[PDB]
């Protein structure tokens, strides 16, 4: 019915008016490319050949467009159509008369997409504003869109079968809009959290930690090669840190050349000892933490997720705030290129040698588990004798579960800490966790020491069978193994009952993901519809479509969210 | 023992039998995270391999068969009953977990191009097209014949030379996209000759005809099935996954010279990023690499039953130490470009990698001024119909946030469904307009002078007309 057509989603009101299928759009699998800049995207030749951007013939560009017309559709840098002044369209594929090929001012030649054509790149779902950013086009000879790895974080895209949409603006006006509002370098900093959206990620973060250690010393030729991939190099080789006996540069010395201009920043490495700041060696840090950059030179410190990642006060954030967006784009790209070419010399890996720990550490983990199981048994015996006293506001069952969970959690965390102590400097799990590229202390703990308690619906594994979790366990067993505690690590291997309980926990995780996607989508759409028309007028009042004043000044101070920074008032706290 | 239960009434035959058919192919399942086993169960259904030994006789749409399937070097005992050895899906690949050039970052994979040239992960894609000569029409007969442009009033400019006399292309003839696989003609009633009814190849198939069959179907009409074969050399978009839930595309392909090489001369067939392992906690992958190295050297297929208690990492490591390699499986690698030893020692070992059905050639689409829909006069939908990608409501909200009003306007009006209407000034309702006659008149007012041209999306015109059919009047007034 008419109401049926209009009412539902994919109806005329929403599926055909608010959103609709569009021309000059393309889609294909995305694959990484460290060599492309932040703003560049790699387009396949067939996608570039099908998509055409019409160019008006001017006296300046008549020769170039004439050559493109002569090439035709077959040769790649060609023109698919000619649009005359009358509006007549001459498709060049079917034979055009040599008279038709002649061009005069006012004709519009539809050239194939070429290098440097601004396009809009999208990945569904388009949760935030950074999910549609304008990319310059670089044509490369394979059939996948290729984007730089730093740009993956705004799109929330990884290269495991993902896909993205490519929209080509078809007019100079809309092309200028994209160029000056939505280009990737312009949207490095999000107004949502006044933090940079994009940060160094994956191999480059892990390798920047290793590159910036005090230990790293580079010989002459390696410095040559690293400087070769630095796009903004002045051409002057820095004086080596160690002139004699053999000239040897340092990793920080080369990274100082990457740092843009003169940027001043102080951040702390992840492994910074808390006591260091109060005690001596505060400035001469024993562990080479406390990153300090003075006059755009890395005086000291080990770079990590905190310094080069997506957080407030990061080196990239200070670069965007101080130097500008263009120099910051160059900063991202140069970090990636130089550090990735050093990683060929150094290299990274993950092996079983990382998961395995010392025998003493294994014995300590086992002893912690033994005494934890004994403590849970003691709590159970207290409960059976009714000696246990109920916690205020909780039933005896709830307080028994609370105490048992506390004992098991303390044992779990202690075993994890022992495992983390066992890790050597060379351990690669520790490299990735310390750098912040991937993983967490929890994952190391589960890999090496103890997987931990499996909880479903906020409780230990429930009694699916009559008063027992699995048919193998005895009825009314509240002990650690029965209710789901997985003593073995992933490396050691889960016993079969623990395997099933672990599967139950993982299933809860999967279900939560699936549910959250839909519910959050609905919430986001409703918010946008409620506040879509609100904008800052030229009075700088924030008004809706009805012209009702939502706010007299935006944010009550009339400032945008990206420019602001965290600061301390310093008059508030001190005593009189 | 210390008394736990003395009244056992039954015993399990083997705990690994709790797993199903797809989860039984996972080696060392108990050493993986649970979501990763769940993901491998889904990925193993999409892997490529010889689906059935009678595949030559069968004419199925979308059949993929790998060139050189291999049975796993590290296999579960329960795989024997699944017949995975008989019909394997995947190839054991020398895999190095290393960061080489940054093209393996995220989940992507660097593949050896020389190995790809030698037959590594090469597959065939068979697509079958069916057509039925229907004489059921009263005066319509869909005869099989080669259409002729002069004889048939309805025809298309795609290549018709391939078709033989019967209207069916002979086996062994290359077919490029937009070529006529089958030529069919419907005789046209002469109300007062021919509307073309040929079937055309899916774009970019680029295959060679394998088998052409002519039979009579259930209805008794002549039935023709044509199978087109296309070889599929792996590319830099194809999706490859291991048995431990690690899926990823091929970032780039380096030749044997460029790939890092051990001292023995072994270069990894596949390089996977070390960053995939820790967050996902798929240690089963690492243990499979170690057991695969030991198995390849020893010559016995390794046992990876889930719950064994006789196979530990330490035992595998000692076994490998006997064969002259580092006990944890690391190997000293040399950089292919410069020859210098890589300072870190890279973990290299054979691992069963699979090739999933998702390939970039099937998933690449580009649209520019294509056909439009009848009802909305908007671009079609789907790769088959050259459909444009949808600019959803979330996308338009992002563009509003940008403040790119003109790009939003182009994308939502000018690129999709531009249209012009004539609207009376006195009454907002649209008015009849004869451009060729140059007379524009509005019914209901008897007014000709006051008419204005309005540019609106065709979908909006349809919306206003559907409102009018419901007796609502959307009077759009320019004033």
């Amino acid at each position: 019915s008419l109401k049926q057509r209009l009412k539902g989603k994919e109806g005329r009101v929403r599926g055909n008016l608010m959103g609709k299928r569009v021309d000059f759009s393309a889609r294909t699998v995305i694959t990484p490319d460290p060599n492309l800049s932040i703003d560049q995207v790699g387009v396949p030749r067939s996608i570039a050949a099908n998509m055409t951007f019409a160019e008006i013939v001017t006296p300046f560009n008549i020769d170039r467009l004439q050559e493109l017309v002569r090439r035709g559709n077959s040769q790649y840098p060609g023109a698919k159509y000619i649009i005359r002044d009358n509006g007549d369209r001459i498709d060049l594929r079917f034979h055009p008369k040599p008279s038709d090929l002649h061009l005069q001012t006012g004709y519009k030649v539809e050239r194939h997409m070429c290098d440097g054509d601004i396009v809009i790149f999208n990945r569904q779902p388009t949760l935030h504003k950074m999910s549609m950013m304008g990319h310059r086009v670089r044509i490369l000879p394979w059939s996948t869109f290729r984007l730089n790895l730093s740009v993956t974080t705004p799109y929330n895209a990884d290269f495991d079968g993902d896909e993205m949409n490519l929209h080509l603006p078809q007019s100079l006006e809309t092309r200028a809009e994209i160029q000056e509002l939505a280009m990737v370098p312009r949207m490095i900093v999000t107004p949502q959290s006044n933090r940079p959206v994009m940060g160094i990620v994956q191999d480059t973060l892990t390798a920047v930690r290793k590159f910036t250690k005090r230990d790293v010393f580079l010989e002459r030729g390696e410095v040559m090669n690293l400087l070769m991939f630095l796009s903004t190099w002045d051409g002057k080789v820095p004086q080596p840190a160690i002139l004699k006996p053999r000239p040897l540069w340092t990793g920080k010395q080369i990274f100082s050349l990457i740092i843009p201009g003169h940027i001043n920043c102080i951040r702390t490495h992840s492994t910074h000892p808390d006591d260091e700041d109060s005690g001596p060696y505060k400035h001469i840090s024993p562990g080479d933490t406390k990153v300090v950059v003075e006059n755009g030179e890395l005086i000291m410190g080990i770079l990590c997720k905190k310094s080069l990642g997506t957080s407030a006060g990061s080196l990239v954030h200070i670069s965007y705030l101080e130097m500008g967006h263009d120099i910051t784009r160059l900063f991202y790209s140069n970090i990636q290129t130089v550090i990735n070419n050093w990683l060929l010399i150094e290299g990274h890996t993950i092996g079983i040698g990382d998961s395995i720990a010392d025998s003493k550490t294994y014995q300590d983990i086992q002893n912690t588990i033994k005494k934890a199981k004994q403590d849970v048994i003691e709590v159970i015996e207290k409960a059976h004798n009714n000696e246990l006293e109920p916690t205020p506001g909780n039933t005896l069952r709830q307080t028994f579960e609370n105490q048992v969970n506390r004992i098991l959690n303390d044992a779990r965390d202690k075993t994890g800490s022992s495992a983390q102590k066992s890790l050597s400097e060379y351990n690669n799990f520790k490299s990735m966790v310390v750098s912040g590229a991937k993983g967490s202390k929890i994952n190391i703990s589960q890999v090496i020491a103890v997987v931990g308690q499996q909880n479903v619906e906020g409780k230990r594994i429930p009694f699916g069978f009559k008063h027992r979790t699995l048919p193998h366990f005895i009825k009314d067993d509240y002990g650690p193994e029965s209710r789901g505690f997985v003593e073995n690590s992933y490396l050691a291997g889960l016993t079969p009952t623990e395997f099933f309980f672990h599967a139950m926990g993982g299933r809860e995780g999967l279900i939560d993901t699936a549910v959250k996607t839909a519910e959050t989508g609905y919430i986001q759409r409703r918010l946008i519809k409620s506040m879509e028309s609100v904008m800052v007028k030229y009075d700088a009042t924030v008004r809706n479509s009805i012209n009702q004043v939502v706010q007299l000044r935006y944010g009550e101070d009339g400032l945008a969210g990206e420019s602001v920074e965290f600061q301390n008032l310093a008059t508030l706290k001190p005593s009189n | 023992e210390v008394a736990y239960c003395s009244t056992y009434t039954h015993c399990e035959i083997h705990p690994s039998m709790i797993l199903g058919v797809c989860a039984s192919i996972i080696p060392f399942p108990d050493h993986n995270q649970s979501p990763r086993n769940t993901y491998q169960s889904a990925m193993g259904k999409q892997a490529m391999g010889v689906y059935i030994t009678n595949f030559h006789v069968r004419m199925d749409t979308l059949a993929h068969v790998l060139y050189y399937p291999q049975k796993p070097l590290v296999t579960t005992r329960s795989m024997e009953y699944l017949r995975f050895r008989e019909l394997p899906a995947g190839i054991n690949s020398i895999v190095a977990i290393a960061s080489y050039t940054g093209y393996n970052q995220e989940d992507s994979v660097i593949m050896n191009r020389s190995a790809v040239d030698r037959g590594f992960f090469r597959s065939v894609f068979y697509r079958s097209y069916k057509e039925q000569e229907s004489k059921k029409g009263f005066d319509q007969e869909e005869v099989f014949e080669k259409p002729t442009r002069e004889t048939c009033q309805g025809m298309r400019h795609a290549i018709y030379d391939k078709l033989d006399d019967d209207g069916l292309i002979a086996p062994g003839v290359r077919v490029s996209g937009d070529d006529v696989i089958i030529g069919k003609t419907v005789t046209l009633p002469e109300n007062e000759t021919k509307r073309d009814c040929s079937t055309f190849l899916r774009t970019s198939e680029t295959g060679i005809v394998d088998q052409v069959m002519v039979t009579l179907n259930q209805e008794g009409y002549k039935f023709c099935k044509i199978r087109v074969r296309s070889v599929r050399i792996p590319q830099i978009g194809d999706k490859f996954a291991s048995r431990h839930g690690q899926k990823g595309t091929c970032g780039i392909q380096y030749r044997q010279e460029d790939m890092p090489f051990t001292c023995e001369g072994i270069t990894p067939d596949i390089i996977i990023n070390p960053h995939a392992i820790p967050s996902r906690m798929t240690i089963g992958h690492l243990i499979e690499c170690l057991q695969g190295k030991v198995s390849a050297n020893k010559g016995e297929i390794g046992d990876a039953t889930p719950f064994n208690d006789a196979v530990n990492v330490q035992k595998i490591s000692n076994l490998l130490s006997d064969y002259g390699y580092h006990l944890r499986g690391n190997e000293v690698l040399y950089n292919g470009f410069t020859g210098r030893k890589i300072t870190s020692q890279i973990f290299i070992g054979p691992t069963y990698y699979q090739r999933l059905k998702h390939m970039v050639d099937d998933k690449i689409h580009s649209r520019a001024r294509g056909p439009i829909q009848i009802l909305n006069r908007q671009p079609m939908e789907g790769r088959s119909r050259d459909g444009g990608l949808r600019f959803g409501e979330m996308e338009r909200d992002c563009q509003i946030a940008h403040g790119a009003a003109q790009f939003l306007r182009e994308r939502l009006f000018e690129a999709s469904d531009p249209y012009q209407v004539h609207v009376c000034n006195l009454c907002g309702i649209m008015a009849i307009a004869n451009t060729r006659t140059h007379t524009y008149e509005c019914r209901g007012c008897r007014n000709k002078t006051q008419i204005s041209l309005v540019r609106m999306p065709y979908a909006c015109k349809l919306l206003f007309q559907e409102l009018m059919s419901m007796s609502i009047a959307p009077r759009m007034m320019s004033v």
Binding site: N405, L408, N409, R412, I442, Q446, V451, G452, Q453, Q454, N455, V456, G458, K459, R460, V486, H502, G505, G506, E508, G509, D512 | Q33, S34
Partner: peptide, 8 residues
Amino acid sequence: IWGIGCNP
């Protein structure tokens, strides 16, 4: 899969 306070 860790604990009651963590993740499943």
